[PDB]
Amino acid sequence: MHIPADSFSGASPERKAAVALRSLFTFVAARVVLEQLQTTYNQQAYLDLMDFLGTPMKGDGGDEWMAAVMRKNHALALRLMEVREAYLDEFEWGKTMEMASRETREANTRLMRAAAM
Amino acid sequence: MHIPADSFSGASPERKAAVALRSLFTFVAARVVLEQLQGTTYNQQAYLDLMDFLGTPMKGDGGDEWMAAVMRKNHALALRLMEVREAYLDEFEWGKTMEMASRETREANTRLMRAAAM
Ligand SMILES: [Mg+2]
């Protein structure tokens, strides 16, 4: 029997980061779809997306925002949902980890060198 | 923590996320150290200074402008904050974070699909 890796957390920096990532993916999806867009239905989708991009995602991973988009333009919301889910397989989280780690070490080294005698 | 506004315009989403995480780790470190300082005259001064600096933003650069400011005031405190934020790299549950983000993205899409299903 396979016992699955622990992937649960309550209030934690990991949860904070996870929700921030979810909002990032929703934003990325909006940008991807905007480029796709830039029929009469497609012109309206473009107008709607531009309107909705004018307002910030609440810090809930983009879901209040997405529900609002769906109320106005279901076809557009379906496309944004598809793209943000597809993006999960494209986002190079390992690279994010490498940069965050390497650049912390580099920043600490720079600061320590600057003050060193 | 609004990742699209982090790093520079033109950065990848991955780089924006990395810089945002760096700022998060700096903040986490500061909270850790503050707690430690509450439960020596130099130790009292580090507490006083940390309380002051937590009153100010670490806008950018992953907390490094903030850290340089701390170091100018209190080098020992900056060394400790640097140590903790670097140590935190290996404490942070990287895999869990991406899996939660991924799973909850799928779940949110499913919730919305089920809601529009009529
Ligand atoms: Mg298609």
Author numbering:
A (entry chain B): 34 to 71, 78 to 156
B (entry chain A): 34 to 72, 78 to 156
Copy the relevant paper text:
A stable fragment comprising residues 34–156 lacking the flexible C-terminal 33 residues was produced by subtilisin treatment, as determined by mass spectrometry (MS). We recombinantly expressed and purified the truncated CrRbcX-IIa(34–156) protein for further structural analysis. The structure of the selenomethionine (SeMet)-labeled CrRbcX-IIa(34–156) protein was solved by selenium-single-wavelength anomalous dispersion (Se-SAD) at 2.0 Å resolution. The experimental electron density was readily interpretable. The structural model was built against data to 1.6 Å resolution and refined to final R and Rfree values of 0.177 and 0.206, respectively. The asymmetric unit of the monoclinic unit cell contains four copies of CrRbcX-IIa(34–156) in a two-fold symmetric topology. Each chain consists of a succession of five α-helices. The subunits form arch-shaped, two-fold symmetric dimers with a hydrophobic cleft in the center, similar to other known RbcX structures. The N-terminal sequence of one subunit binds into the central cleft, with residues Met34 and Ile36 reaching into hydrophobic pockets located between the anti-parallel helices α1 and α1’ at the bottom of the cleft. The N-terminal ammonium group of Met34 engages in a tight salt bridge (lengths 2.53 and 2.58 Å) with Asp90 from the opposing dimer, which presumably stabilizes the tetramer arrangement. Indeed, CrRbcX-IIa(34–156) formed mainly tetramers in solution as detected by native-MS.
